Amino acid sequence: KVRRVKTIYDCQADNDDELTFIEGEVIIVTGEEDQEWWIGHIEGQPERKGVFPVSFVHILSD
Template structure:
């Protein structure tokens, strides 16, 4: 499992696309997303190059930021 890079505190461009999680991810902060390997999330933005914003597909209340290295972008 890759080690995520530290987060910075700025927001970036918005994207909307499905991504599949490759590893379990446990949130360390309130604004981070917890997910299990194999879940599909809907990418809604980019906090920075290494941290993206998403919610779990079908569960928009489960949202937050996560390290990009934990997911695989699905084909459109």
């Protein structure tokens, strides 16, 4: 259902499958690990990708 989210905090990956981002970036959601962790990549920078905490984003699209 959810396709685009906007990050609301900074986040540094703790593990090598995790996405590092700053606040204000758009993520394209491409998958889910669980209710607290989704998978995606940066809109406009798809090479930046990985697992990220859902609590760190606001739903934007879909």
